């Protein structure tokens, strides 16, 4: 097949700025290349077809050039409801190929998260699984490292992160942390913490409880 | 107003079949390719199936993954776009999008969820994930709901009803070491407000008909 790759994968600008994304195929593609916004849960959006040409109804702050196997996207001033994922489309030659995709985010300020942890119900240990659950809310950037202590030991292959999209109001990340272990092993420890290092903070920052005490 | 309505899709075993459909209006489909798309849960965009018009010959392409297990198909008198899918493998797994690219559009259908797995459907466990009370008190506390162990995706979750979104987060799910599905849904409220405040989360399982009310207290000892 046609081999697209798309260049940055991911990158983050402010608003008003201008924006070029590149799209590069293995082959001369005569133009046949087609650009699409994908907002996140929401199917894609055609915005570019023919290397240039706009869709009706897409802003002409958007704007698409290119030739041969050389093409790029261009947002002129960046808006708020521009972020999303950006697609290139080859449909020169079947199998229509797309790139990988470029993220595009929002920057914002340093923000460093509350963090917050959740001891197992007793209704789960109920049925003999504890569940740990530690949240990091609200922070910018994305990396941030989160590390479980039990009774003052690392934990290691069984914790589980999940992180949301960017808020639409606050342009911050939410980080969750799931440490899963056995009813036995969980019962047989007292001090559980959460330890936060993040870019927004001086010094990591830890939530603990002790299994037992309310 | 062009529309591609899809139905179909959901939970269906390896090595069984499906088929999907796609309803298009407001556009002159008989003129025009029709195509079937991809997209792995997390993953890039793929192309599965094209068909041409009656104009010509209704020429049928194929991705060479699925070359002889799908078949896409159209009827024209119905603005009906299909795609039988035969002998169905794990890597199979994604959401399907019905397109049709005009002369100077491109229309996708809102996608359905295809998932190949011999397993049966599985409603959530939902759990409490209450603050105990060191919560700063004239700050912000945390509140939610752990929603484990379910099959197939999705779940959503509300909160009281859908009259608490501010500082509402539901993340995305996990998959777990169990194959398993699990997320989190979490909420920051004023501190002042445990105890005489009340938050319950709406969690709903289509695919199992589940629908499951926890009401997240502070706890007691
Ligand atoms: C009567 C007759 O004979 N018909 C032929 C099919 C051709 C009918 C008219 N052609 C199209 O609408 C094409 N659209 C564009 O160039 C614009 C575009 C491209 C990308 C994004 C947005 C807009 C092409 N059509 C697709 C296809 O043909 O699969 C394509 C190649 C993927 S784009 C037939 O039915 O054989």
């Known amino acids: 097949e046609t081999t697209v790759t798309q260049s940055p994968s991911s990158m983050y600008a402010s608003l008003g700025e201008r924006v070029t994304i590149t799209c590069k195929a293995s082959q001369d593609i005569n133009s046949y290349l087609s650009w699409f916004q994908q907002k996140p849960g929401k199917s894609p959006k055609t915005l570019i077809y023919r290397a240039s040409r706009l869709v009706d109804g897409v802003p002409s702050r958007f704007s698409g050039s290119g030739s041969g196997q050389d093409y790029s996207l261009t947002i002129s001033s960046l808006e708020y409801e521009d972020m999303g994922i950006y697609y290139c489309?080859?449909?020169?030659?079947?199998?229509?190929?797309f790139g990988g995709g470029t993220k595009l985010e929002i920057k914002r300020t340093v923000a460093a998260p509350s963090v917050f942890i959740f001891p197992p119900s007793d209704e789960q240990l109920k049925s003999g699984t504890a569940s740990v659950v530690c949240l990091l809310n609200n922070f910018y950037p994305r990396e941030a490292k989160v590390q479980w202590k039990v009774d003052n030991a690392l934990q290691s292959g069984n914790s589980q992160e999940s992180v949301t999209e960017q808020d639409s109001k606050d342009s911050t990340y939410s980080l969750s942390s799931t440490l899963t272990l056995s009813k036995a092993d969980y019962e047989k420890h007292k001090v559980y913490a959460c330890e936060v290092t993040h870019q927004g903070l001086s010094s990591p920052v830890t939530k603990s409880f002790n299994r037992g005490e309310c | 107003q062009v529309q591609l309505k899809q139905s179909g899709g959901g939970l269906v075993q390896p090595k069984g079949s499906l088929k999907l459909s796609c309803a298009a209006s407001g556009f002159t489909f008989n003129t025009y390719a029709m195509h079937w798309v991809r997209q792995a849960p997390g993953k890039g965009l793929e192309w599965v199936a094209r068909i041409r018009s009656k104009s010509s010959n209704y020429a049928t392409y194929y991705a060479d993954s699925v070359k002889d297990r799908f078949t896409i198909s159209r009827d024209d008198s119905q603005s009906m776009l299909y795609l039988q899918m035969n002998n169905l493998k794990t890597e199979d797994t994604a959401m399907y999008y019905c397109?049709?690219?005009?002369?100077?559009?491109?229309?996708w259908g809102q996608g359905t969820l295809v998932t190949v797995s011999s397993a049966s459907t599985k409603g959530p466990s939902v759990f409490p994930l209450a603050p105990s009370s060191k919560s700063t008190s004239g700050g912000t506390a945390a509140l939610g709901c752990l929603v484990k162990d379910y099959f197939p995706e999705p779940v959503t979750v509300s909160w009281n009803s859908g009259a608490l979104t501010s500082g509402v987060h539901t993340f995305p799910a996990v998959l777990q070491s169990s194959g398993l599905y699990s997320l989190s849904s979490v909420v920051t409220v004023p501190s002042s407000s445990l105890g005489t405040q009340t938050y319950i989360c709406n969690v709903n399982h289509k695919p199992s008909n589940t629908k499951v009310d926890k009401r997240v207290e502070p706890k007691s000892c």
């Open positions: 397109v049709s690219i005009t002369t100077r559009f491109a229309y």
């Open positions: 489309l080859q449909y020169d030659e079947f199998p229509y190929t």
